[PDB]
Each structure stands twice: as structure tokens, then as C-alpha cells.
Amino acid sequence: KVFGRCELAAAMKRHGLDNYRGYSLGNWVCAAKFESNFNTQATNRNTDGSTDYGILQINSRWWCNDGRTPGSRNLCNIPCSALLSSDITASVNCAKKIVSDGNGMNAWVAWRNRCKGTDVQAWIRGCRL
Ligand SMILES: [Cl-]
Ligand SMILES: [Cl-]
Ligand SMILES: [Cl-]
Ligand SMILES: [Cl-]
Ligand SMILES: [Cl-]
Ligand SMILES: [Cl-]
Ligand SMILES: [Cl-]
Ligand code: NA
């Protein structure tokens, strides 16, 4: 599924990401835009041989099992394929664990390089939330 911007904002808010660990909703939408272009089916291989899955590009090195990432963990206890669903529940629940892990949203390279320090409220401008 390719979400609309405000559609995704609404879904993320419903799932309690608005100000989760202090990150306003615009941060999450911005991260999703640059990670996946709001596409739940996005997959991208990393240099280390791991793969990033779904709307928030969650990595198989640490977070989900994809059966082909040697020496990896599965700390969200989920098959990576579940992160590609049109239902973002699994992605959001796993993201909550990631952002709580010590480094905040800096775990998302694209957030650090493209969203941090910017006017992230722009990403929810015009949305009925
Ligand atoms: Cl957009
Ligand atoms: Cl915001
Ligand atoms: Cl594996
Ligand atoms: Cl393969
Ligand atoms: Cl594990
Ligand atoms: Cl959803
Ligand atoms: Cl933080
Ligand atoms: Na893994």
C-alpha cells in the first residue's frame, strides 16, 4: 500500500506515535517519506548484507527475521515480511522498541540526515488529525 501523507499521519497517531519518546508526529511522517516514500512494500539491501523492510525500513540485522541475515537478532520477534503489510501495526510496535533503545530516532539514518533540525511540522500541515 502507498499511503497518502495525511492518511499515514492519522494511522501513526491512532497507534500512539504522536510524541512517543518525545518525537512529534511530523518526525515520524518525515522519516517514513524519506525511508519508503510511504510505501509499505519497500525493501532495500544494506551494505552489510541485511535488508530494511516496510514503511520505516526496519533492519533484519537486529529487529526482524528474514532467514538470510547471518548472525542477526530478531528483537521485535517477527518475520520481516510482516513489516510489508498494508496494516502498519507491526511496523509501529517494532519502531516503538527501536526508538526506546537509547539513540532515539537517530537509529533511522534518513531521519538524522533529512528530518532532524528541520521544520518537521510541515509534514502534517493541512491534515485533519
Ligand atoms: Cl508527500
Ligand atoms: Cl510535528
Ligand atoms: Cl537470519
Ligand atoms: Cl536471497
Ligand atoms: Cl533475537
Ligand atoms: Cl494501519
Ligand atoms: Cl531521544
Ligand atoms: Na534478523
Curated annotation (Swiss-Prot):
Pfam family, one: Lys
Domain (C-type lysozyme): residue spans on this chain: 1-129
Main localization, broad class: secreted
Gene Ontology molecular function, alphabetical: beta-N-acetylglucosaminidase activity; identical protein binding; lysozyme activity
GO biological process: cell wall macromolecule catabolic process; defense response to bacterium; defense response to Gram-negative bacterium; defense response to Gram-positive bacterium; killing of cells of another organism
Location in or out of the cell: Secreted
Active site (record annotation): E35, D52
PROSITE patterns, per the entry: GLYCOSYL_HYDROL_F22_1, GLYCOSYL_HYDROL_F22_2
Tissue note: In the egg white and polymorphonuclear leukocytes.
Listed EC numbers: 3.2.1.17
Keyword Zinc: no
Binding site for substrate: D101
The family this protein is said to belong to: Belongs to the glycosyl hydrolase 22 family.
Role of this protein: Lysozymes have primarily a bacteriolytic function; those in tissues and body fluids are associated with the monocyte-macrophage system and enhance the activity of immunoagents. Has bacteriolytic activity against M.luteus.
Additional notes on this entry: Lysozyme C is capable of both hydrolysis and transglycosylation; it also shows a slight esterase activity. It acts rapidly on both peptide-substituted and unsubstituted peptidoglycan, and slowly on chitin oligosaccharides.
Protein name: Lysozyme C
